Amino acid sequence: AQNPNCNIMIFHPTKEEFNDFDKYIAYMESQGAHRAGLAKIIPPKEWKARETYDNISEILIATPLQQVASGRAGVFTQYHKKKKAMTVGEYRHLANSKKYQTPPHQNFEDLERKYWKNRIYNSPIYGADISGSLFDENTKQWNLGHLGTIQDLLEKECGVVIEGVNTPYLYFGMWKTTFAWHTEDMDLYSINYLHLGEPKTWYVVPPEHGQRLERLARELFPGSSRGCGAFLRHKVALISPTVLKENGIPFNRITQEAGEFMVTFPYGYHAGFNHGFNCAEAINFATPRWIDYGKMASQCSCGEARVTFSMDAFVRILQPERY
Amino acid sequence: AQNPNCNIMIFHPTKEEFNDFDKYIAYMESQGAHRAGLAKIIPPKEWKARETYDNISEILIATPLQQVASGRAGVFTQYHKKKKAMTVGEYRHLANSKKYQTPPHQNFEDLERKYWKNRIYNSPIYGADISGSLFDENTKQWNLGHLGTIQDLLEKECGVVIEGVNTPYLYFGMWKTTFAWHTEDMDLYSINYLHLGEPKTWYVVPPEHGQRLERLARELFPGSSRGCGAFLRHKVALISPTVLKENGIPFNRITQEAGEFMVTFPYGYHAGFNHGFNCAEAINFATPRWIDYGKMASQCSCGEARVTFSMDAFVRILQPERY
Ligand SMILES: Cc1ccccc1S(N)(=O)=O
Ligand SMILES: Cc1ccccc1S(N)(=O)=O
Ligand SMILES: Cc1ccccc1S(N)(=O)=O
Ligand SMILES: Cc1ccccc1S(N)(=O)=O
Ligand SMILES: Cc1ccccc1S(N)(=O)=O
Ligand SMILES: Cc1ccccc1S(N)(=O)=O
Ligand SMILES: O=C(O)CNC(=O)C(=O)O
Ligand SMILES: O=C(O)CNC(=O)C(=O)O
Ligand code: NI
Ligand code: NI
Ligand SMILES: [Zn+2]
Ligand SMILES: [Zn+2]
């Protein structure tokens, strides 16, 4: 079996290899990439997402989210307090202000130490889940707004036609902005391109060990666990790498820089944080191997987790009992 | 000037001409097609939207709308009463039931007579505005889910990058289901493909005469007009061809059949009805010529008209005062 220790793999496709998205995902999996839950793809040097990022300041963040923490430094939840609308230009200025800017630090490791030591004592503002794309329409390869849809994948694999659409989201981040431990809706894949700015650090649990993280989460967030059988779907819980090591949870970490893609694989739990002002674009996608994971995916039914309209059809066809 | 009487033109592109969407729209306008407000495009015989429509019965209509009329036979409003969810298979069966099925009739003209005589005395159920597509992903030409986005058009023309996305909608219709007099959001173009089933009859006012229809509508719906300076944006008002002729409003009519595209042009008011069970797919799009119309488009501010999240950026950039 390939990649038995479930390490995060890094790929450097040639421009020829970069012409067929589906084929390259399948290639990565033939090398065992999916066992980690996360892979990095560095695009060929000839490729570009767009010409420049010079005219993006007028994009609106209609509902910036202030991420307020509760708990202890290595085990906490965050809730999202809605703030008034601001443009990306205004958001960038805020990110770079004395109150919110990245502190002096020696390297990625020093910054990681500072994040887990001090995250809970601040409430950074995140521009998340903004429907849109920054890929040039003329960018024909790995354009996250031009991928085959999950609805068409399900139709190709299972022969059923369903309603729903599948479009990218933009994420504007600043120092300490955080994504909580989660898998994707319906345990789909995701792909994430860091367009511009400071890095994003990722933590990931191998899909074959996801239930170990779930069991620890139930122990560490007992009230939340009693409230919902799938509360990690709420996307509010954080657990530090030190606490993961203390509890024997297998995981890996890697830092994504501007110009790089990350792919998360079905049922690969991930979490992380931004180093400073940045902009990422992400979308869910599927492959034939996803179907079995979609059939088995946990669901939140307590009402907290937001459901997209497109998720309805997934549950209806793949999980009719639970529907 | 081409097409000075503002007639609806019908186009028969060759398979070679069908390879460049933007170029063919520009060609149609060079022949004066836009002056009518509406054009028909019959695709080349070699083209197909998808292989078959055999497996569409499991699509869900989450919120079927019962279209209840008030007023007189030739001048009425309709409101949409929400019904419980049903599949397309269930909807088709309902459409074909004795209560809702198309009556015996001699031709399109006889059916049109019956529609305007009797529409208000029934309340047909419409499956409208369902996000999704029935184009095969392998259909590369005139695939309504693969068009250049309006956001990218605005960026190409004006140099500003904005948030927002632009995806198709499905419409499942039955006898007497009705679309009220309207122009598109931000006076955009629309394109509509009739995938399957019975015809759709369209009425259209030339864009250069749109204000004539507005003035008549203010006279015929006086309470609505007092409530909102752009109440046709509510998409609830119907006026018959007989009443249009009585009031000297220039208009044309045409019937769309399965396998045919219709394009509506900026500020071309249109209305119409379905002949029996059918399924259409539609999406808005833009061209360089649209920008001037978008800048001038009326807006509903009374709160009735539904606004998509994507419309925000259009108003913000093209109409900053009104924003
Ligand atoms: C093969 C190689 C080489 C250097 C770094 C990483 C890899 S990989 N693709 O992560 O196994
Ligand atoms: C950028 C480029 C250039 C030439 C051939 C192929 C590509 S790519 N990497 O497949 O988009
Ligand atoms: C113990 C250790 C050390 C470094 C990285 C990851 C681990 S573990 N085994 O995944 O908890
Ligand atoms: C030229 C032609 C011919 C027959 C019917 C319609 C037309 S058109 N394209 O509507 O002018
Ligand atoms: C269907 C077809 C076939 C051959 C060439 C071009 C086409 S089309 N009409 O441009 O999709
Ligand atoms: C009078 C008439 C007759 C047939 C179609 C259209 C009209 S008109 N002139 O558009 O109101
Ligand atoms: O970038 C973020 O803030 C979170 N992204 C993801 O969880 C993802 O791409 O799957
Ligand atoms: O088909 C309908 O019910 C209404 N369609 C439109 O108004 C359109 O395509 O612009
Ligand atoms: Ni994710
Ligand atoms: Ni319309
Ligand atoms: Zn829940
Ligand atoms: Zn209004």
PDB file of C-alpha atoms in Angstrom, chain A residues 29-159:
ATOM      1  CA  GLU A  29      -4.373   8.901  -5.236  1.00  0.00           C
ATOM      2  CA  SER A  30      -2.454   6.139  -7.076  1.00  0.00           C
ATOM      3  CA  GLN A  31       0.555   7.384  -5.087  1.00  0.00           C
ATOM      4  CA  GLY A  32      -1.409   7.273  -1.814  1.00  0.00           C
ATOM      5  CA  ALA A  33      -1.926  11.030  -1.389  1.00  0.00           C
ATOM      6  CA  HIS A  34      -5.476  10.649  -0.063  1.00  0.00           C
ATOM      7  CA  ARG A  35      -4.306   8.639   2.960  1.00  0.00           C
ATOM      8  CA  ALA A  36      -3.053  11.885   4.546  1.00  0.00           C
ATOM      9  CA  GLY A  37      -6.378  13.685   4.076  1.00  0.00           C
ATOM     10  CA  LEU A  38      -4.563  16.639   2.484  1.00  0.00           C
ATOM     11  CA  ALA A  39      -2.142  17.229  -0.430  1.00  0.00           C
ATOM     12  CA  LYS A  40      -0.253  20.272  -1.761  1.00  0.00           C
ATOM     13  CA  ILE A  41      -0.068  20.969  -5.497  1.00  0.00           C
ATOM     14  CA  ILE A  42       2.434  23.508  -6.773  1.00  0.00           C
ATOM     15  CA  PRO A  43       1.351  24.621 -10.259  1.00  0.00           C
ATOM     16  CA  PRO A  44       3.810  24.643 -13.180  1.00  0.00           C
ATOM     17  CA  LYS A  45       5.882  27.812 -13.539  1.00  0.00           C
ATOM     18  CA  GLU A  46       4.138  28.664 -16.828  1.00  0.00           C
ATOM     19  CA  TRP A  47       0.688  28.815 -15.187  1.00  0.00           C
ATOM     20  CA  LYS A  48      -1.075  31.827 -13.636  1.00  0.00           C
ATOM     21  CA  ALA A  49      -4.494  32.281 -11.996  1.00  0.00           C
ATOM     22  CA  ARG A  50      -4.816  35.812 -13.372  1.00  0.00           C
ATOM     23  CA  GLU A  51      -2.601  38.669 -14.587  1.00  0.00           C
ATOM     24  CA  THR A  52      -2.551  40.822 -11.417  1.00  0.00           C
ATOM     25  CA  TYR A  53      -4.455  41.393  -8.184  1.00  0.00           C
ATOM     26  CA  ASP A  54      -4.352  45.178  -8.628  1.00  0.00           C
ATOM     27  CA  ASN A  55      -8.080  45.871  -8.816  1.00  0.00           C
ATOM     28  CA  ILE A  56      -9.675  43.715  -6.109  1.00  0.00           C
ATOM     29  CA  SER A  57     -10.075  46.377  -3.423  1.00  0.00           C
ATOM     30  CA  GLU A  58     -13.686  47.122  -4.374  1.00  0.00           C
ATOM     31  CA  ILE A  59     -14.941  43.601  -3.660  1.00  0.00           C
ATOM     32  CA  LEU A  60     -17.462  43.792  -0.802  1.00  0.00           C
ATOM     33  CA  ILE A  61     -17.329  41.672   2.335  1.00  0.00           C
ATOM     34  CA  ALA A  62     -21.031  42.009   3.152  1.00  0.00           C
ATOM     35  CA  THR A  63     -20.809  40.235   6.513  1.00  0.00           C
ATOM     36  CA  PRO A  64     -17.344  40.171   8.113  1.00  0.00           C
ATOM     37  CA  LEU A  65     -17.197  37.705  11.017  1.00  0.00           C
ATOM     38  CA  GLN A  66     -15.480  38.472  14.327  1.00  0.00           C
ATOM     39  CA  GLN A  67     -14.190  35.156  15.698  1.00  0.00           C
ATOM     40  CA  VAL A  68     -14.637  35.199  19.460  1.00  0.00           C
ATOM     41  CA  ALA A  69     -13.066  32.330  21.456  1.00  0.00           C
ATOM     42  CA  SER A  70     -14.136  30.544  24.652  1.00  0.00           C
ATOM     43  CA  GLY A  71     -12.240  27.900  26.597  1.00  0.00           C
ATOM     44  CA  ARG A  72      -8.541  27.252  27.143  1.00  0.00           C
ATOM     45  CA  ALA A  73      -5.591  27.961  24.861  1.00  0.00           C
ATOM     46  CA  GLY A  74      -5.404  24.450  23.397  1.00  0.00           C
ATOM     47  CA  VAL A  75      -9.107  23.503  23.599  1.00  0.00           C
ATOM     48  CA  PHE A  76     -11.637  26.163  22.660  1.00  0.00           C
ATOM     49  CA  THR A  77     -14.686  27.010  20.627  1.00  0.00           C
ATOM     50  CA  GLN A  78     -15.275  30.098  18.537  1.00  0.00           C
ATOM     51  CA  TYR A  79     -18.463  31.862  17.593  1.00  0.00           C
ATOM     52  CA  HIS A  80     -18.938  34.308  14.763  1.00  0.00           C
ATOM     53  CA  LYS A  81     -20.200  37.784  15.592  1.00  0.00           C
ATOM     54  CA  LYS A  82     -21.479  39.647  12.523  1.00  0.00           C
ATOM     55  CA  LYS A  83     -19.918  43.035  11.752  1.00  0.00           C
ATOM     56  CA  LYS A  84     -20.868  45.807   9.347  1.00  0.00           C
ATOM     57  CA  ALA A  85     -19.965  45.505   5.667  1.00  0.00           C
ATOM     58  CA  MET A  86     -16.573  46.619   4.408  1.00  0.00           C
ATOM     59  CA  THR A  87     -14.658  46.518   1.136  1.00  0.00           C
ATOM     60  CA  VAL A  88     -11.566  44.361   0.663  1.00  0.00           C
ATOM     61  CA  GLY A  89      -9.517  47.589   0.692  1.00  0.00           C
ATOM     62  CA  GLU A  90     -10.933  48.530   4.094  1.00  0.00           C
ATOM     63  CA  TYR A  91     -10.447  44.958   5.357  1.00  0.00           C
ATOM     64  CA  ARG A  92      -6.796  44.919   4.231  1.00  0.00           C
ATOM     65  CA  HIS A  93      -6.174  48.194   6.062  1.00  0.00           C
ATOM     66  CA  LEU A  94      -7.787  46.725   9.191  1.00  0.00           C
ATOM     67  CA  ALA A  95      -5.697  43.532   8.937  1.00  0.00           C
ATOM     68  CA  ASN A  96      -2.516  45.634   8.780  1.00  0.00           C
ATOM     69  CA  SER A  97      -3.464  47.891  11.721  1.00  0.00           C
ATOM     70  CA  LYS A  98      -1.542  47.684  15.000  1.00  0.00           C
ATOM     71  CA  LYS A  99      -4.475  45.907  16.685  1.00  0.00           C
ATOM     72  CA  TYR A 100      -4.664  43.054  14.159  1.00  0.00           C
ATOM     73  CA  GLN A 101      -1.306  42.791  12.357  1.00  0.00           C
ATOM     74  CA  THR A 102       0.997  39.757  12.519  1.00  0.00           C
ATOM     75  CA  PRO A 103       3.491  40.128  15.395  1.00  0.00           C
ATOM     76  CA  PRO A 104       7.272  40.071  14.996  1.00  0.00           C
ATOM     77  CA  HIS A 105       8.404  36.444  14.705  1.00  0.00           C
ATOM     78  CA  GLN A 106      11.464  34.412  13.723  1.00  0.00           C
ATOM     79  CA  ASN A 107       9.952  31.763  11.401  1.00  0.00           C
ATOM     80  CA  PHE A 108       6.756  29.733  10.720  1.00  0.00           C
ATOM     81  CA  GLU A 109       7.408  27.649  13.867  1.00  0.00           C
ATOM     82  CA  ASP A 110       7.684  30.702  16.136  1.00  0.00           C
ATOM     83  CA  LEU A 111       4.472  32.084  14.656  1.00  0.00           C
ATOM     84  CA  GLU A 112       2.721  28.718  15.203  1.00  0.00           C
ATOM     85  CA  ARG A 113       3.827  28.785  18.862  1.00  0.00           C
ATOM     86  CA  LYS A 114       2.437  32.301  19.251  1.00  0.00           C
ATOM     87  CA  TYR A 115      -0.852  31.328  17.587  1.00  0.00           C
ATOM     88  CA  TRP A 116      -1.608  28.468  19.982  1.00  0.00           C
ATOM     89  CA  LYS A 117      -0.362  30.399  23.012  1.00  0.00           C
ATOM     90  CA  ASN A 118      -2.331  33.585  22.350  1.00  0.00           C
ATOM     91  CA  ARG A 119      -5.201  32.950  19.865  1.00  0.00           C
ATOM     92  CA  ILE A 120      -7.954  32.891  22.476  1.00  0.00           C
ATOM     93  CA  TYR A 121      -7.080  36.377  23.795  1.00  0.00           C
ATOM     94  CA  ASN A 122      -7.932  38.080  20.488  1.00  0.00           C
ATOM     95  CA  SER A 123     -10.926  38.195  18.152  1.00  0.00           C
ATOM     96  CA  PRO A 124      -9.749  38.535  14.536  1.00  0.00           C
ATOM     97  CA  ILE A 125     -12.197  39.360  11.743  1.00  0.00           C
ATOM     98  CA  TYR A 126     -12.650  36.894   8.845  1.00  0.00           C
ATOM     99  CA  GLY A 127     -14.215  37.508   5.452  1.00  0.00           C
ATOM    100  CA  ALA A 128     -15.512  33.997   4.780  1.00  0.00           C
ATOM    101  CA  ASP A 129     -17.856  32.227   2.378  1.00  0.00           C
ATOM    102  CA  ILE A 130     -18.132  35.025  -0.185  1.00  0.00           C
ATOM    103  CA  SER A 131     -19.579  33.651  -3.424  1.00  0.00           C
ATOM    104  CA  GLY A 132     -17.253  34.575  -6.279  1.00  0.00           C
ATOM    105  CA  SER A 133     -14.004  33.850  -8.136  1.00  0.00           C
ATOM    106  CA  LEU A 134     -10.682  35.555  -8.848  1.00  0.00           C
ATOM    107  CA  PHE A 135      -9.620  33.216 -11.663  1.00  0.00           C
ATOM    108  CA  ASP A 136      -9.322  34.880 -15.075  1.00  0.00           C
ATOM    109  CA  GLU A 137     -11.961  33.412 -17.410  1.00  0.00           C
ATOM    110  CA  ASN A 138      -9.102  32.747 -19.860  1.00  0.00           C
ATOM    111  CA  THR A 139      -7.331  30.523 -17.348  1.00  0.00           C
ATOM    112  CA  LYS A 140      -8.370  27.150 -18.678  1.00  0.00           C
ATOM    113  CA  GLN A 141      -6.510  24.811 -16.305  1.00  0.00           C
ATOM    114  CA  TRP A 142      -7.309  24.312 -12.594  1.00  0.00           C
ATOM    115  CA  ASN A 143      -9.790  27.189 -12.741  1.00  0.00           C
ATOM    116  CA  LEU A 144     -11.926  26.587  -9.646  1.00  0.00           C
ATOM    117  CA  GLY A 145     -14.969  28.148 -11.353  1.00  0.00           C
ATOM    118  CA  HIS A 146     -14.741  25.751 -14.325  1.00  0.00           C
ATOM    119  CA  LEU A 147     -14.667  22.350 -12.619  1.00  0.00           C
ATOM    120  CA  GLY A 148     -17.102  19.575 -13.419  1.00  0.00           C
ATOM    121  CA  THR A 149     -20.004  19.796 -10.981  1.00  0.00           C
ATOM    122  CA  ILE A 150     -20.781  17.375  -8.187  1.00  0.00           C
ATOM    123  CA  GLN A 151     -24.291  17.025  -9.598  1.00  0.00           C
ATOM    124  CA  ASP A 152     -22.856  15.892 -12.933  1.00  0.00           C
ATOM    125  CA  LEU A 153     -20.486  13.491 -11.163  1.00  0.00           C
ATOM    126  CA  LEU A 154     -23.403  11.893  -9.297  1.00  0.00           C
ATOM    127  CA  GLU A 155     -25.316  11.638 -12.556  1.00  0.00           C
ATOM    128  CA  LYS A 156     -22.354  10.053 -14.375  1.00  0.00           C
ATOM    129  CA  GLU A 157     -21.799   7.523 -11.578  1.00  0.00           C
ATOM    130  CA  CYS A 158     -25.350   6.686 -10.483  1.00  0.00           C
ATOM    131  CA  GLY A 159     -27.501   7.689 -13.461  1.00  0.00           C
TER     132      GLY A 159
END
